[PDB]
């Protein structure tokens, strides 16, 4: 009984970094489709349905082989986008602070180095996928996954993610993925990332 | 070594099925990029056609295999794709090709349903294909720029389902794009490829 979450802001609140039309289609069509298909996949499996989408994707091995693909793709779609909306803000941007900033400077050397490495991962993901900042064994690291696969399935907790499926940027940037990635930094809600960091 | 092929028609020749903006960007940016990157990756491999190159990545240095796989596949796939479209295309298959399709799939309509299902079912980026395997017609789909050629199969018809191929005009509506695709397919070219394979 999963549901499509409402956005924390207006559809045009992230302009011009992300266009109103993309936000509208991305949320009401793409994300919504993952929710619809996810509910159809777990229909009848009270056990799986009672778990949060994150818990569900965290253990795909416990999902029946007959619907494992559907849960992987659609569960991943729902988990990834639900997190993604909460990481954006019309009042975001800037740089991390507190414990998160300290960890970033210690692991990557500096926030600028982190952005360079994160941008490289996002640009290097061939095909559809996501670029991530996760906590693995209590350590921060950058990774990328294909399609709707989530780091949660490998025991890693994402605290920042960038959707690099073409639907996330084609209307305003077309083939210019690097320009989309650069614009991303202007809307990142580092306060939310910091909260997820503490929880991870 | 490798170069970007010219389109057999104008950028707006496939309208309204495929918009001129998409054709222009798809060819001059996406395809051109695959060519540029392929050339960077590639001594002896240079003398091999892109088709033969992708036909056996196993014989390619593991230090550049991924580059050749993605960019070589990109070049080979798009090179073929452009030749399968035409402003005078569409209609329905004929001759021996039509006979084989009706025999294997039951009818052209059934073939279209199966092809569209494969194309709509490809999760993420990829391609839907009609290939000749061991002399038999089969419908398959590959991820990203992977090609049936790498599996010993010969593609005679292919549909690009990467979102860049249809997002400007169809956005999330991939099924409407697949439907419009039938109006521009060059069946004489598919038939020619089938006869040689
Ligand atoms: Mn998305
Ligand atoms: Mn393409």
């Amino acid at each position: 009984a999963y549901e499509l979450p409402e956005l924390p802001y207006a559809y045009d609140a992230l302009e011009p970094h992300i266009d109103k039309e993309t936000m509208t289609i991305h949320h009401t069509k793409h994300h919504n489709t993952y929710v619809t298909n996810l509910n159809k996949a777990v229909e009848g499996n009270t056990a799986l349905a009672n778990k949060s989408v994150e818990e569900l994707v965290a253990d795909l091995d416990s999902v029946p082989e007959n619907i494992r693909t559907a849960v992987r793709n659609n569960g991943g779609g729902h988990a990834n986008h639900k997190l993604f909306w909460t990481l954006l803000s019309p009042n975001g941007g800037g740089e991390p602070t507190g414990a998160l900033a300290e960890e970033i400077n210690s692991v990557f050397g500096s926030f600028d180095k982190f952005k360079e490495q994160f941008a490289a991962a996002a640009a290097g993901r061939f095909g559809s996928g996501w670029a991530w900042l996760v906590v693995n064994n209590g350590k921060l690291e950058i990774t990328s996954t294909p399609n709707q696969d989530s780091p949660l399935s490998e025991g890693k907790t994402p605290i920042l993610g960038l959707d690099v499926w073409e639907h996330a940027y084609y209307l305003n940037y077309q083939n210019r993925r690097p320009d989309y990635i650069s614009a991303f930094w202007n809307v990142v809600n580092w306060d939310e990332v910091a909260r997820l960091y503490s929880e991870r």
Side-chain angles (χ1 to χ4, degrees), chain A residues 1-199:
Chain A
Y2 303 100
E3 295 179 62
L4 181 73
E6 56 181 55
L7 294 177
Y9 39 69
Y11 287 85
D12 66 345
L14 305 181
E15 290 269 19
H17 317 293
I18 300 179
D19 52 297
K20 180 185 186 175
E21 179 171 46
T22 291
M23 290 302 301
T24 295
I25 302 165
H26 202 179
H27 185 237
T28 74
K29 298 297 190 303
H30 293 292
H31 192 176
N32 189 245
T33 287
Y34 291 130
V35 179
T36 300
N37 289 339
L38 174 56
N39 284 321
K40 297 173 63 62
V42 301
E43 181 178 54
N45 194 316
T46 305
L48 296 179
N50 289 318
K51 304 187 299 187
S52 69
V53 64
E54 292 81 10
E55 289 157 44
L56 188 62
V57 295
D59 301 305
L60 267 51
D61 300 299
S62 297
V63 178
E65 296 182 300
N66 71 307
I67 57 168
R68 188 170 301 168
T69 294
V71 175
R72 177 184 187 176
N73 296 338
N74 297 293
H78 183 35
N80 300 341
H81 293 80
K82 194 165 70 63
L83 173 62
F84 191 57
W85 308 134
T86 71
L87 298 173
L88 309 174
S89 178
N91 301 149
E95 54 187 57
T97 59
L100 172 59
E102 297 176 303
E103 194 76 300
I104 290 178
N105 301 324
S106 300
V107 177
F108 310 91
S110 68
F111 178 52
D112 306 57
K113 285 178 177 300
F114 158 75
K115 288 195 296 176
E116 285 164 49
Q117 295 171 55
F118 184 89
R125 165 50 58 179
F126 194 77
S128 306
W130 293 72
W132 310 97
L133 167 53
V134 310
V135 176
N136 196 185
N137 299 307
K139 309 175 184 181
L140 291 179
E141 67 181 24
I142 292 172
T143 75
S144 66
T145 58
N147 309 139
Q148 294 303 338
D149 293 356
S150 166
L152 289 170
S153 303
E154 301 174 59
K156 304 172 183 180
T157 301
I159 56 174
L160 174 60
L162 174 60
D163 189 359
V164 293
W165 277 59
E166 293 180 316
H167 64 231
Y169 63 89
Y170 220 72
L171 294 184
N172 193 269
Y173 302 85
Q174 293 84 57
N175 66 109
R176 301 178 290 115
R177 192 191 288 180
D179 291 336
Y180 161 63
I181 298 169
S182 298
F184 177 57
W185 303 122
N186 300 305
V187 293
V188 175
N189 181 171
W190 289 109
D191 289 326
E192 185 54 39
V193 181
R195 297 158 188 165
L196 298 178
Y197 173 70
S198 296
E199 294 282 43

